[PDB]
Design a protein around this ligand. Sequence first.
Ligand SMILES: *[C@@H]1O[C@H](CO)[C@@H](O)[C@H](O)[C@H]1NC(C)=O
Lengths: 38, 49
Amino acid sequence: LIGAEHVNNSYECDIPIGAGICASYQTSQSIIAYTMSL
Amino acid sequence: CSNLLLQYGSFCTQLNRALTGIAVEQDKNTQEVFAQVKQIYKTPPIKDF
Ligand SMILES: *[C@@H]1O[C@H](CO)[C@@H](O)[C@H](O)[C@H]1NC(C)=O
C-alpha cells in the first residue's frame, strides 16, 4: 500500500481492503490505514 | 495472443465482473453471520457460573 500513512490506533473502517485492515480519510486531512475495530 | 483478445475482451469483462462479485459476496457472507452484535463483550474474570 502506497499513498496512505499507517496509524496504530483503530476506528471503524468503511473502505475494505483485506486481512483485517482498511483505509479511510481522517485528519490537514489525509488517507490513513488502520486495523478495524470490531 | 493479446492481439486476438480484443474480440473476447467483452467475455473477459463478464468473467472478471463475475469473479469480483463472487469475492465481494464471500466477503459479505462472513459479515451477516459473525457480526450480529456491534459491541465486544469481555468475559468476566469470575468463572463461578
Ligand atoms: C503505536 O503505538 C505503539 C505503542 O507502543 C508503538 O509501539 C507504535 O510504534 C506506534 N505506531 C506508530 C505508527 O506510531
